[PDB]
Structures are given as C-alpha cells and as structure tokens.
Subunit: 62 residues, 8 copies
C-alpha cells in the first residue's frame, strides 16, 4: 500500500439509501460526487453495508 490511505467506501442497495460514505484512516466522511467514488475505488475497497448496520460499523471503525 503506497497510497497512505486505509479504509473503504460503503453504500446500501436496499430501501433507505444513505448515498456513498467512506472510512479514510479511521475518519468517516460523506461523499458528494460520483467522480470521487470512482477515484477512491482505485485505491480502497468498495463494499455494501445496510443502513441498519452502519451504527455498529462506526463503533468498530472509531
């Protein structure tokens, strides 16, 4: 890993979308633009997380 970035993008394909978010070096952020999603997808994984599970993930990525 040469990027200096550890984390992942997350979104849900279920009923109540929250858009795309990411953990970037242990900091959670919202992503506003699809360009940015595509850019980060070059260096970090992009996974699915249900809206109901986001809270628990945040606890673990705290």
């Amino acid at each position: 890993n040469v990027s200096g970035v550890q984390g992942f993008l997350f979104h849900t394909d279920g009923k109540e979308s929250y858009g795309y978010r990411a953990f970037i070096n242990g900091v959670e952020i919202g992503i506003k633009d699809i360009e940015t999603v595509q850019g980060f997808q070059q260096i970090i994984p992009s996974i699915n997380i249900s809206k109901s599970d986001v809270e628990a993930i945040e606890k673990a990525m705290k």
Copy 2:
C-alpha cells in the same frame, strides 16, 4: 491491509442460530443484514463457530 479492517465474521449453521457476528479491529459486533455480511465477506474471512464455542473465542479475542 488496505481496508483498515482486521477481523472475521462468524456464525453457526447449528440448530440455534445466533445470526452473524464479527470481530472488527478487536471490537465484537452483531451484523443485522445479509447485505452487510456479503459486503464484509469481500474484505475479511467468514468462518463457522458453534454457539457453545463463542464464549471461549470472545475471551481469547479480549
């Protein structure tokens, strides 16, 4: 490495399910939705642990 996540998903296929759980960076969580299970299966392993063995694993992961 790049995901910023070390850990694993665990469940039992035995007669009394406890659903899916995970250790994520040393923190134990419940996972509510199968979307989230499949998301995390892209970046961390997913193993079987019997209901009777969860206690010892929880203690070892302390």
Copy 3:
C-alpha cells in the same frame, strides 16, 4: 493476514486424546464442536501435538 488471529489448532492422534484445542492470540482454549474446528481451519493452521508435549508448548505459547 487479514483475520486478526494468530495461532493454531492442535490435537493428538495417539492413545490419550484431549480433543481439539487452540492457541488464539496467545490464549489457549478448548474447542467443543467440530464445526468450530472446521471454521478455524479456514484461517489458522491445524497441527498434531502429542499429549506429553502439550505442557512444554503451553510454556512457549505463554
């Protein structure tokens, strides 16, 4: 290693079986169910240790 687990399963195929055990991040545990053995075999090695040698291994894995 993405699991956050270092260690191994151990058992003997000799006269006085002690079932399966494991070292998980330097903590020794008994394993009650074969499901759990199979699960851990996905992420950590599974080796043979004679009953007579368990005591010495415990000293080294202390």
Copy 4:
C-alpha cells in the same frame, strides 16, 4: 516502499479545475507542472476527487 513516499495525486475533471494536488507523507501540496504529475505517477497513485469532496478528504487526511 522504496521511494520513501506514501500518498496520492488528486484532481477533478469537473467544470471548475483545482489543478493537481497531492498528499505526500501526510503533507498536502499543490503541483504546478504536468511533468511533475507524470513523475509522481510512476511511484504513487493518481485519483479523481471532485472539488466539493476535497474538504472532507483534507480533514480525513489530518
């Protein structure tokens, strides 16, 4: 590893360019010349970040 540089180049292809920027060993810089962009592209990744998302990434990389 061998370069002594962890980080990435970022730019947007959107309507209002901010040129190329980089995080180099946790320090954010502007890059003035495309020669330098192509030089750094030999050793670190180069991704797209929208203008609207730069703020959050800057905060996360703090």
Copy 5:
C-alpha cells in the same frame, strides 16, 4: 506469520542424539514425541545442529 510461532526444530543425526528440541518464540523446549515434531514441521523449519554446536546456538538465541 499466521501461526503465531517463530522458531525452529533442531536435532543431530550424529552418534549421540539429544532428541528433538525447538526454539518457539524465543523459548527453548524439548519435544518428546515424533507426532509433535511432524506437527511443528508443518509450520516451522526443522534443521540439524550437532551436539557440540548446541551451546553456542543456545547463547545466540538468548
């Protein structure tokens, strides 16, 4: 890496055996049973050390 064990087995094939010994995470132990030798041979190397050379190796591994 994943085993949580760094070290090696040692023995001599010379005229006076000292059996099998091991350094396991910096701790020297005797191994009593060949089952255990073969178990550990799945995860750590197994080398020859003459009886006359064991002393110096023990000191170096201090």
Copy 6:
C-alpha cells in the same frame, strides 16, 4: 528493500535544468556525476520533477 535506502532521484527535462538531485532517507543531495545517477537507479526510482515544483516537494520530504 534490502538496500537501507528510501527515496528517489529527480531531474527536469524542461527549460531550466537543475541537474540530478535525490532524496536519500529524507536528506536532499545534489548528484555531481552520471555514474552516481546510474548507480542509484539500480536501487531507487528515478522521476521527473519540474524546477517550479522542487520547493513544494522539499516541504513534503522534510
């Protein structure tokens, strides 16, 4: 990396050449001889940096 050296050579192919320079374990040096450039090219990357960008790179490689 077995060399004990992290860094890179840099030069520009643009108007105002500054010759070859390098960062070697976070220390910037001028290189006087092409032999030395060729030698370091065996163990560290060699990239292009415009004269106008050298100042900003020095800030990040400080």
Copy 7:
C-alpha cells in the same frame, strides 16, 4: 521469515581459513561441525568473507 533467526554463515576459501562462523541475531559464533553448517544453510544465507575483512564486518554486525 518464520525461523526467528536473522544472519548468515561465513567462511573464506582463501589462504588462512578460519573455518565456518555465523552471525545469529547479532551474535557471532564459531561453528564446530559441518552438520551444523548444513542445517543453518536451510534457513540463513551462506557467504564468503576474507579473513582480512572479518574485523570490519564484526564492527557492522555489533
């Protein structure tokens, strides 16, 4: 490296042999038996060092 040993065997093929020696985790030792040389050759490199250079190497491996 799973052995827990870093170093090398050394000998000279020149006029004034000093037998085989080794650095084992920064400790210099003489090796008395060829069996031991063969054993260590399974886990660490074996190189040539002239008798005249041993003193300088010892300084660096101190």
Copy 8:
C-alpha cells in the same frame, strides 16, 4: 530480511578508485578483498558511486 543485513556496496569505475566500501546496518566500512565483495553481492545490492559524490551519500546515510 533473513540475512540481518540492510545496505549496499559502492565503488567507482572512474580514474581514481577508492576500492569497495559498504554501508552495513547504517555503518560505513571498507572492504579489502574481492572475495568479500562477491560474498556480500549474494545478499545486498552493489552500486556505483563516483568519488566526488561519496561525501554527500555519507552525510545522507548519517
């Protein structure tokens, strides 16, 4: 990794030789004999550095 040696050999092929030198675990040494040069070439890189550039490299490796 396994050798316990990080560094490199250096020499010039220019008109005034300084022989072979090495940085071995951050310590600069002279090498007297070509046997030793070839021994170390099995485990660490060997590069060219002009006589005029040795000073700057020595300072950088401080």
